[PDB]
Write a protein that holds these residues in place. Structure first.
Motif, PDB file in Angstrom:
ATOM      1  N   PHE A 142      37.060  40.299  39.527  1.00  0.00           N
ATOM      2  CA  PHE A 142      38.367  40.823  39.499  1.00  0.00           C
ATOM      3  C   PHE A 142      38.352  41.822  38.281  1.00  0.00           C
ATOM      4  N   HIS A 143      37.978  41.622  37.024  1.00  0.00           N
ATOM      5  CA  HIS A 143      37.794  42.536  35.969  1.00  0.00           C
ATOM      6  C   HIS A 143      36.899  43.791  36.229  1.00  0.00           C
ATOM      7  N   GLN A 144      35.738  43.618  37.143  1.00  0.00           N
ATOM      8  CA  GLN A 144      34.709  44.553  37.464  1.00  0.00           C
ATOM      9  C   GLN A 144      35.445  45.487  38.364  1.00  0.00           C
ATOM     10  N   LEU A 145      35.995  44.882  39.428  1.00  0.00           N
ATOM     11  CA  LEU A 145      36.679  45.687  40.216  1.00  0.00           C
ATOM     12  C   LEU A 145      37.788  46.478  39.938  1.00  0.00           C
ATOM     13  N   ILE A 146      38.593  46.105  39.138  1.00  0.00           N
ATOM     14  CA  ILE A 146      39.739  46.713  38.840  1.00  0.00           C
ATOM     15  C   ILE A 146      39.277  48.046  37.988  1.00  0.00           C
ATOM     16  N   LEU A 147      38.202  47.810  37.060  1.00  0.00           N
ATOM     17  CA  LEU A 147      37.691  48.981  36.298  1.00  0.00           C
ATOM     18  C   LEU A 147      36.953  50.050  37.123  1.00  0.00           C
ATOM     19  N   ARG A 148      36.139  49.665  38.309  1.00  0.00           N
ATOM     20  CA  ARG A 148      35.519  50.358  39.142  1.00  0.00           C
ATOM     21  C   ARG A 148      36.644  51.261  39.904  1.00  0.00           C
ATOM     22  N   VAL A 149      37.692  50.613  40.513  1.00  0.00           N
ATOM     23  CA  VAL A 149      38.726  51.479  41.295  1.00  0.00           C
ATOM     24  C   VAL A 149      39.347  52.322  40.292  1.00  0.00           C
ATOM     25  N   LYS A 150      39.547  52.004  38.993  1.00  0.00           N
ATOM     26  CA  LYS A 150      40.276  53.052  38.401  1.00  0.00           C
ATOM     27  C   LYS A 150      39.316  53.893  37.694  1.00  0.00           C
ATOM     28  N   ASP A 151      37.946  53.575  37.838  1.00  0.00           N
ATOM     29  CA  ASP A 151      36.938  54.473  37.305  1.00  0.00           C
ATOM     30  C   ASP A 151      37.265  54.616  35.500  1.00  0.00           C
ATOM     31  N   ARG A 152      37.570  53.469  35.088  1.00  0.00           N
ATOM     32  CA  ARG A 152      37.775  53.411  33.286  1.00  0.00           C
ATOM     33  C   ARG A 152      37.189  52.202  32.676  1.00  0.00           C
ATOM     34  N   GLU A 153      37.000  52.438  31.271  1.00  0.00           N
ATOM     35  CA  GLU A 153      36.350  51.549  30.599  1.00  0.00           C
ATOM     36  C   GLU A 153      37.198  50.410  30.132  1.00  0.00           C
ATOM     37  N   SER A 154      38.410  50.632  30.216  1.00  0.00           N
ATOM     38  CA  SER A 154      39.534  49.453  30.199  1.00  0.00           C
ATOM     39  C   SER A 154      40.629  49.878  30.873  1.00  0.00           C
ATOM     40  N   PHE A 155      41.457  48.960  31.140  1.00  0.00           N
ATOM     41  CA  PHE A 155      42.780  48.983  31.645  1.00  0.00           C
ATOM     42  C   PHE A 155      43.565  47.896  31.497  1.00  0.00           C
TER      43      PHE A 155
END
Ligand SMILES: Nc1nc2c(ncn2[C@@H]2O[C@H](COP(=O)(O)OP(=O)(O)NP(=O)(O)O)[C@@H](O)[C@H]2O)c(=O)[nH]1
Ligand SMILES: [Mg+2]
Length: 168
Positions: A96-109
């Motif tokens: 989940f952590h990986q996917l959120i950051l990949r979809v957002k294209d961000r280092e943190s969210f």
């Protein structure tokens, strides 16, 4: 009057819906009825600042979907929920952590790691230490909850996500 889209994600059965319904309606739902997608809206004052909370209670899917892409893109903050009685649900936090950051294209969210069902002491398999080790790895807050009466940290969890979003 800002709107925060707070998205509740996690494996099947971890308590996403029970937590959400406890937050909105102050009742524990003992039944396990799998979610497709449910939205809850409230106009509420948190820390002296009025907000609209748009809470999305999601399906317990492990595999990726268009539905999940949509909510990971639009979400303003995420509760990544696992059940302390379900070791796999904890292991899958990384997905989940990986996917959120990949979809957002961000280092943190904005996100909080939620360790749910801590009232089930005799069934608990993921310890507080394990949870904190995971949260520290991602540098995100860790909170333990129970949706069962009397609830534990339910208002705090949703309000803390709002605080994280605001403190950006
Ligand atoms: N003892 C206890 N039971 C809980 C807690 N949270 C949820 N449950 C129970 O766990 C089961 C699954 O809860 P539910 O909210 O449906 O989980 P979910 O993550 O929304 N499932 P889905 O992914 O299928 O939509 C239900 O029987 C519910 O009562 C909790 O904190 N404590
Ligand atoms: Mg559900």
């Amino acid at each position: 009057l800002p709107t925060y889209k707070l998205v509740v994600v996690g494996d099947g059965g971890v308590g996403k819906s029970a937590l959400t319904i406890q937050f909105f309606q102050k009742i524990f739902v003992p039944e396990y009825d799998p979610t497709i997608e449910d939205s809850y809206l409230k106009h509420t004052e948190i820390d002296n600042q009025w907000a609209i909370l748009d809470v999305l209670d999601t399906a317990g899917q492990e595999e990726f979907s268009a539905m999940r892409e949509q909510y990971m893109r639009t979400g303003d903050g995420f509760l990544i929920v696992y059940s302390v009685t379900d070791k796999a649900s904890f292991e899958h936090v990384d997905r989940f952590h990986q996917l959120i950051l990949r979809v957002k294209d961000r280092e943190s969210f904005p996100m909080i790691l939620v360790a749910n069902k801590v009232d089930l002491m005799h069934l608990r398999k993921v310890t507080r230490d394990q949870g904190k080790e995971m949260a520290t790895k991602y540098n995100i807050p860790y909170i333990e909850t129970s949706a069962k009466d009397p609830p534990l940290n339910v208002d705090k969890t949703f309000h803390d996500l709002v605080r994280v979003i605001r403190q950006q």
